[PDB]
Every structure is written in C-alpha cells, then in structure tokens.
Amino acid sequence: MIMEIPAIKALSRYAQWVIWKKERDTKIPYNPNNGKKASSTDPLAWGDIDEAQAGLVRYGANGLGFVLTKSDPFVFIDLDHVLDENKRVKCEWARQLLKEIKSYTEISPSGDGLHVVVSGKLPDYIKHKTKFDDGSALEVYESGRYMTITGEVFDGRDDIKELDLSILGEFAEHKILDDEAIIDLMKRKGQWPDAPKDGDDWSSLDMSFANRLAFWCGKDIERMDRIFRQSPLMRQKWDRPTAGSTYGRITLKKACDFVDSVYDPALRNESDCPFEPYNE
Numbered sequence: 001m002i003m004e005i006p007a008i009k010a011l012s013r014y015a016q017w018v019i020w021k022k023e024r025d026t027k028i029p030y031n032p033n034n035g036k037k038a039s040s041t042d043p044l045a046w047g048d049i050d051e052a053q054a055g056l057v058r059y060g061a062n063g064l065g066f067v068l069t070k071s072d073p074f075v076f077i078d079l080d081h082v083l084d085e086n087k088r089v090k091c092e093w094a095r096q097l098l099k100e101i102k103s104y105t106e107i108s109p110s111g112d113g114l115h116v117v118v119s120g121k122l123p124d125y126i127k128h129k130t131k132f133d134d135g136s137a138l139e140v141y142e143s144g145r146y147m148t149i150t151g152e153v154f155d156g157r158d159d160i161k162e163l164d165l166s167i168l169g170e171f172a173e174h175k176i177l178d179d180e181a182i183i184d185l186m187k188r189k190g191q192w193p194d195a196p197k198d199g200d201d202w203s204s205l206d207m208s209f210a211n212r213l214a215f216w217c218g219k220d221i222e223r224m225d226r227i228f229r230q231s232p233l234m235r236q237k238w239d240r241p242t243a244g245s246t247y248g249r250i251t252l253k254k255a256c257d258f259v260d261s262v263y264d265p266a267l268r269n270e271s272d273c274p275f276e277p278y279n280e
C-alpha cells in the first residue's frame with residue numbers, strides 16, 4: 001500500500017532510496033543492491049524504490065530510507081519523543097508546528113516520533129538539531145542526510161505540500177590542527193576516555209583527561225575546553241562556580257601547569273606523551 005500514498009509516489013520519482021538496519025542506538029543506511037554500507041554522498045550507492053523494496057526483504061533490514069539531496073525539492077523535519085503511548089501528540093511545540101506546517105506526516109519507526117516532509121527551503125539562520133528540556137527534539141535537513149520511511153501516515157496527512165518554512169525560526173534555535181582532528185588523534189592513541197563507571201572518582205578522571213588534553217592541544221585552554229565538552233566526562237559540574245572560577249576552568253589550568261611537554265603538530269612528537277593509553 002506504500003506506493004498508494006501520494007507522498008511516497010512523489011519520493012519514488014527519485015533514485016535516492018536506501019535501506020536501514022538498527023545497530024544498537026543507531027540506524028545505519030545500506031545500499032539496497034549489494035548490502036554494503038551506503039554513503040550519503042555517493043548516488044550510485046542508492047537505488048530506486050523498487051530496488052529498495054527488494055533489498056529490504058533480501059537482507060532483512062528494518063525498513064526503507066530516502067537520501068535527501070540539494071537538488072531535490074524535499075525538506076525533512078524530525079520530531080523526536082513527541083508522541084504518547086497512544087501515538088498521540090504530547091509536546092505543545094510539536095502540536096503548534098503541526099498546525100502551521102500541514103504536509104506529509106508519518107510516525108517514525110520508534111512509534112514516539114514524527115517525520116514531516118515538505119517542499120521548500122530551510123531558513124539559513126537555524127540550527128539543524130534543537131533539544132528541549134522536555135527531552136523531545138527538533139531536527140531539520142534538506143540535504144546531506146537520509147530519513148527512514150515508514151508509510152504510517154499520521155492524521156491522514158499523506159501529501160507533500162509546497163509551504164513556506166520561515167515559521168521554523170519560531171521552533172528551532174538560531175545560530176550564526178582542528179578539534180576533530182585532535183579527537184581522532186587521541187582516539188587512535190587510546191587517550192580518549194570511557195564514560196565513568198560505578199564507583200569511579202569522576203573528578204580524578206577529569207584531571208587525568210585534562211592532563212592529556214594539555215599535551216595534545218598544546219596547552220590551548222580554549223581548545224581543551226571545547227574538546228572536553230564533547231567527551232564522556234562532560235557534566236554540569238564543569239561549569240559550576242568555584243572560588244571565582246569554574247571547576248572546569250580550574251581543572252584545565254592545573255593541567256596546563258602540571259604538564260611538561262606539548263604535542264607539536266609539525267614535529268609529530270607523539271612519543272613525547274607522558275601518559276600511557278587508557279586500558280580496555
């Protein structure tokens with residue numbers, strides 16, 4: 001019946017279909033024609049809907065997916081954790097968005113979220129993902145991402161509409177070596193920390209990690225802070241005030257004074273690191 005849905009017929013015009021399978025907390029896209037993992041940039045890693053349907057039964061994947069590209073007219077709106085046990089809307093921001101963006105709406109594969117597919121253009125001043133105290137979240141994309149396709153039409157909104165999307169500025173938040181290269185470096189050296197366990201002195205885990213950051217970041221405390229905030233050791237205590245500074249700032253400053261040598265990107269003195277790798 002999926003091809004009966006007018007919105008699915010609209011998506012089936014494009015050979016931008018994939019299949020996906022649940023891997024722990026994630027949904028990995030796969031090439032429907034050979035079962036290999038699919039890039040979101042390689043068009044020949046995708047197929048048309050017929051090939052996606054066949055690959056779905058062949059590899060026993062969880063469902064269909066559609067890769068969004070710049071040239072196609074579709075915008076993908078991801079609403080997470082906005083539904084009831086009854087698959088009923090419980091978040092007021094999601095209820096207001098649905099009142100102002102009436103287009104194809106389907107229930108996401110976890111049963112507690114929603115997808116809205118619209119024809120239009122995203123405002124250029126909004127974040128891709130917005131998280132709310134609620135625990136729900138709003139995620140919007142028009143290219144460089146795939147979306148799962150369920151066909152579970154919500155409220156009979158089964159047609160992709162052409163709508164203005166300037167209204168999304170009322171829901172999403174606004175926005176105006178490198179860190180990622182350093183993070184990958186520390187991971188390959190095994191200097192990236194695990195999440196703390198039961199009975200772990202978190203504060204000394206912070207200090208050990210801060211000492212490693214001082215070396216690999218060249219004692220650039222701003223970069224040390226940006227990288228720490230993306231680590232499994234980040235918590236609210238990092239920004240709690242303490243003696244006219246923050247706990248995180250005092251930790252990073254003590255690491256900068258404690259640590260002797262530094263990693264020089266031009267000298268590649270990875271062997272000068274004084275700390276053994278984290279065990280596994």
Ligand SMILES: Cc1cn([C@H]2C[C@H](O)[C@@H](COP(=O)(O)OP(=O)(O)OP(=O)(O)O)O2)c(=O)[nH]c1=O
Binds near residue numbers: 147
């Ligand atoms: C590469 C990749 C893409 N995606 C894509 C596919 C998702 O449809 C889309 C939105 O992320 P999610 O909201 O986490 O997944 P979902 O909306 O399809 O299902 P639900 O929210 O009900 O659990 O991001 C992943 O989720 N994980 C990945 O690893």
Ligand SMILES: [Mg+2]
Binds near residue numbers: 078079080108113114
């Ligand atoms: Mg979702």
Ligand SMILES: [Mg+2]
Binds near residue numbers: 068070072073074
């Ligand atoms: Mg697009």
